[PDB]
Symmetry: C2
Subunit: 142 residues, 2 copies
Amino acid sequence: AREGIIGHYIHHNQRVGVLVELNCETDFVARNELFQNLAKDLAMHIAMMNPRYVSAEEIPAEELEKERQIYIQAALNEGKPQQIAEKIAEGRLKKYLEEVVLLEQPFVKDDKVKVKELIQQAIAKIGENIVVRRFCRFELGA
Amino acid sequence: AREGIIGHYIHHNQRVGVLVELNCETDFVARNELFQNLAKDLAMHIAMMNPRYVSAEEIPAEELEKERQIYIQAALNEGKPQQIAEKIAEGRLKKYLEEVVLLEQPFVKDDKVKVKELIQQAIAKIGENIVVRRFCRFELGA
């Protein structure tokens, strides 16, 4: 069975809302405010940063390749030979992962830390494995 | 463009959370507490009642038929001839719609009103078309 909480964040303008399931090992940690603040902060980060996936593995190979091809064609359209265009696309893909993947995004409260490192920091402090299971972000009109 | 708000409800035990996009015609109504209370109440209803769809049209024909066949086979397994089993299944399907469809569920704050009628009541009072666009319900461990 899963332990943890459903963290959330509702923007003051009530135009953006997020729910996030943050899992841990025990109800004791789940009830703890340190863990509760982490779920709350993750929910706020998601609302502000709009990631589409929790992790890189969730991106469809077709979605990834299409984006990569856009990068490639653009460079090719710049007169860049295939080999260069591929390296350029390589870099833009890394950026693309930071645009859409939660764990790869710099944390809203400290952009010097990626969300995945924030999580490792929490596991080290708290002492239990912590996992962001899923999240849902609704934005008015989008 | 869409007007309205993202309503929400987080259970006190933080084990269930819901976001609901409630749409209206103007920002003036969207900012209004009557509309805001309706979005809030819909979000609470969803959290407590666990509907899977907003409306009946969203149910997969395969999901519906499978459920209907369970009803039918059960009655057939009771020695009920096909014609009777079909009428029994007909009734259980109506109930099935009330189990999983939001608009067909009796409102948590007044079970004498289906959520769809609550909405018609709000449109009559408020004076603008109101639509539940979508909702997301997260439950810890489920």
